[PDB]
Write an enzyme that holds these catalytic residues in place. Sequence first.
Site, PDB file in Angstrom:
ATOM      1  N   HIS B  41      50.358  70.127  58.520  1.00 33.81           N
ATOM      2  CA  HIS B  41      50.433  70.341  57.072  1.00 33.81           C
ATOM      3  C   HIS B  41      49.100  70.029  56.341  1.00 33.81           C
ATOM      4  CE1 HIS B  41      51.000  66.218  55.544  1.00 33.81           C
ATOM      5  NE2 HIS B  41      51.978  66.004  56.431  1.00 33.81           N
ATOM      6  N   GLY B 143      48.696  59.610  51.574  1.00 35.27           N
ATOM      7  CA  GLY B 143      47.494  59.462  52.390  1.00 35.27           C
ATOM      8  C   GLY B 143      47.754  58.841  53.758  1.00 35.27           C
ATOM      9  N   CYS B 145      49.876  60.018  56.037  1.00 33.34           N
ATOM     10  CA  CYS B 145      50.181  61.078  57.007  1.00 33.34           C
ATOM     11  C   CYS B 145      49.167  61.073  58.144  1.00 33.34           C
ATOM     12  CB  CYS B 145      50.225  62.436  56.314  1.00 33.34           C
ATOM     13  SG  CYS B 145      51.590  62.627  55.145  1.00 33.34           S
TER      14      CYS B 145
HETATM   15  O1  LIG Z   1      55.709  63.417  52.100  1.00 31.33           O
HETATM   16  C1  LIG Z   1      54.488  63.512  51.957  1.00 31.33           C
HETATM   17  C2  LIG Z   1      53.792  64.854  51.855  1.00 31.33           C
HETATM   18  C3  LIG Z   1      54.666  65.991  52.334  1.00 31.33           C
HETATM   19  C4  LIG Z   1      55.459  66.705  51.442  1.00 31.33           C
HETATM   20  C5  LIG Z   1      56.346  67.670  51.896  1.00 31.33           C
HETATM   21  C6  LIG Z   1      56.456  67.935  53.252  1.00 31.33           C
HETATM   22  C7  LIG Z   1      55.639  67.248  54.128  1.00 31.33           C
HETATM   23 CL1  LIG Z   1      55.696  67.634  55.827  1.00 31.33          CL
HETATM   24  C8  LIG Z   1      54.750  66.286  53.691  1.00 31.33           C
HETATM   25  N1  LIG Z   1      53.661  62.450  51.897  1.00 31.33           N
HETATM   26  C9  LIG Z   1      53.983  61.098  52.120  1.00 31.33           C
HETATM   27  C10 LIG Z   1      54.211  60.553  53.383  1.00 31.33           C
HETATM   28  N2  LIG Z   1      54.602  59.292  53.615  1.00 31.33           N
HETATM   29  C11 LIG Z   1      54.805  58.509  52.566  1.00 31.33           C
HETATM   30  C12 LIG Z   1      54.627  58.917  51.221  1.00 31.33           C
HETATM   31  C13 LIG Z   1      54.861  58.068  50.116  1.00 31.33           C
HETATM   32  C14 LIG Z   1      54.629  58.491  48.830  1.00 31.33           C
HETATM   33  C15 LIG Z   1      54.858  57.554  47.690  1.00 31.33           C
HETATM   34  O2  LIG Z   1      55.472  56.493  47.836  1.00 31.33           O
HETATM   35  O3  LIG Z   1      54.329  57.921  46.554  1.00 31.33           O
HETATM   36  C16 LIG Z   1      54.161  59.797  48.607  1.00 31.33           C
HETATM   37  C17 LIG Z   1      53.946  60.651  49.649  1.00 31.33           C
HETATM   38  C18 LIG Z   1      54.177  60.247  50.989  1.00 31.33           C
END
Ligand SMILES: O=C(Cc1cccc(Cl)c1)Nc1cncc2cc(C(=O)O)ccc12
Lengths: 296, 305
Positions: B41, B143, B145
């Site tokens: 992604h 961030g 990921c």
């Molecule tokens: O989920 C996503 C991005 C995303 C979106 C749709 C599909 C996919 Cl495959 C990936 N990123 C995040 C991963 N982990 C923790 C995360 C915590 C937060 C938070 O606590 O703000 C935000 C994003 C977070």
Amino acid sequence: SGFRKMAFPSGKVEGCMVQVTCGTTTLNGLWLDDVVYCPRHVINYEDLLIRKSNHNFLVQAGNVQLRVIGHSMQNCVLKLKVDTANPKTPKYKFVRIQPGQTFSVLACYNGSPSGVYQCAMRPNFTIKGSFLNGSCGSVGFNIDYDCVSFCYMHHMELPTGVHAGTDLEGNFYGPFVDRQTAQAAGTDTTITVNVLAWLYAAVINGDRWFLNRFTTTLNDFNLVAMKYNYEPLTQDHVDILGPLSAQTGIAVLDMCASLKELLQNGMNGRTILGSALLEDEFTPFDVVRQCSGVTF
Amino acid sequence: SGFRKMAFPSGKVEGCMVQVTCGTTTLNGLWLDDVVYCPRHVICTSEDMLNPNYEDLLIRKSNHNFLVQAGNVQLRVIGHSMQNCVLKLKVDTANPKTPKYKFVRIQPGQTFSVLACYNGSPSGVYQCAMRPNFTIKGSFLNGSCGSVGFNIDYDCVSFCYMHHMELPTGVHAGTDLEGNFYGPFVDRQTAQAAGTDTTITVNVLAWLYAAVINGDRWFLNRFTTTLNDFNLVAMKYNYEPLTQDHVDILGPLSAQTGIAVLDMCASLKELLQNGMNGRTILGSALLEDEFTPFDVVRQCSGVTF
Ligand SMILES: O=C(Cc1cccc(Cl)c1)Nc1cncc2cc(C(=O)O)ccc12
Ligand SMILES: O=C(Cc1cccc(Cl)c1)Nc1cncc2cc(C(=O)O)ccc12
Ligand SMILES: [Cl-]
């Protein structure tokens, strides 16, 4: 989202762990530059040390034997001068922490790291660690930017299963001595400023059931804290919680009234951050760091 | 003595963390030998996430579109391929800090350490378990990921998880290092919800054996149970069924403490019925399920107190 007990990455400390052997005793040492630091109980300590020569101390770094070229004592720590400087020596400081402060522990056996965990220096100066025989010399640390601040070295286990040790200058935390004698940890108390920080972390993560409309005074709250074996909350603690209070919109004495109600009524079958007890091993700084993403 | 939630030392994994940038997206990568592994992604915009066609998005990319940073050094990308939900970036430098490693796919109930990273920089390490609903209750911000899950048995790092996304309930979903998701999840912004979660029964039993090893027996009783009667009760408290495999796996801990698995199952039944009555087990007021039988044997002494 999520709230875990988190330790600092241990890599900079792993590159310093060595095995120290003297006679039949084998424990862990910390190799920084050309000196290996370890508990002096590996050896009247001055009378026992004078009878030992450099070659009596066997130091092993991985599969390499280090040559001991000098030895001296500083309080309850033995300093072994070696011929080779540790090429993996990180930027470091020796710091003495206060009760309530947290740190990471790299538990080691035979100079080999086996696990990393986070813990706090209790108000009774003990640590509720997880250590077996051979763990002596394992160290506690924090990381600030790229500098490792070494704050603890493991020396002994007390009859209740709790642990006692020194700073890296060999000064014990607590009224403990490095010898087999009747020693007991004092009655422990809950670290109030840390429980408050953890209640702010719960609010940040969407857990608000314990919030109420009430506020209190430092005086009224400290009478309640004294009744439930909680450490007194000082004006310094209130100031330190300022940023978390500003972020959530809940004044520190507004949150104190929530804690007063939790102490007098319990949780009523509910949990806070997946816990049925009030957690006191996260400092206000730990809560801010974990809910911001600071890297090392 | 003592019992803590313990993570593996993270050093061998820290030396593999890099930052991967593609356009405006920045996430973490795992640099092993001359390949950088990261969530596919990274090639998406937020818009793309509703129905991304990754093959269509990837064919439009060239090697120089991917920026890889290891510390203060830029790595040159010389190839790229997709394997399931992971992007594999061939680089012109092999990681000199590459540890001995394997890619392993774990089962629910298994535990592992997570090295949480932001911008290819490690910030923290914690221990967690693959839930029965295939999610992990992690601690991750935007961030994170590309952060990885691992076990270190002896000198070999077994990579088992790569972080991809956060679900609406705050739980986390990801893949093994071959890009296959754990659970019925997709790397798409769509209505995805974690299934109802359950307690890992074999792990709660292991943790009750750890309490007995550390000197606590207040919860034991004079009863036994059949395996089927245990499961009929446990399933009413949202506990996973205990299989004969679980009973076999608990054999060593049963032999060490002298308490038959089905007698420990009877204490668990009673604990579920009565609660703890103001008492704790290993400093906890809840029944802990994130320590496997193997974790208990590793952390506890071989001599019962
Ligand atoms: O989920 C996503 C991005 C995303 C979106 C749709 C599909 C996919 Cl495959 C990936 N990123 C995040 C991963 N982990 C923790 C995360 C915590 C937060 C938070 O606590 O703000 C935000 C994003 C977070
Ligand atoms: O305390 C000692 C030895 C000792 C004795 C008198 C004075 C000093 Cl300074 C040191 N060693 C241990 C330290 N930590 C965990 C320990 C767990 C165990 C165990 O679980 O078997 C045994 C010993 C343990
Ligand atoms: Cl598994």
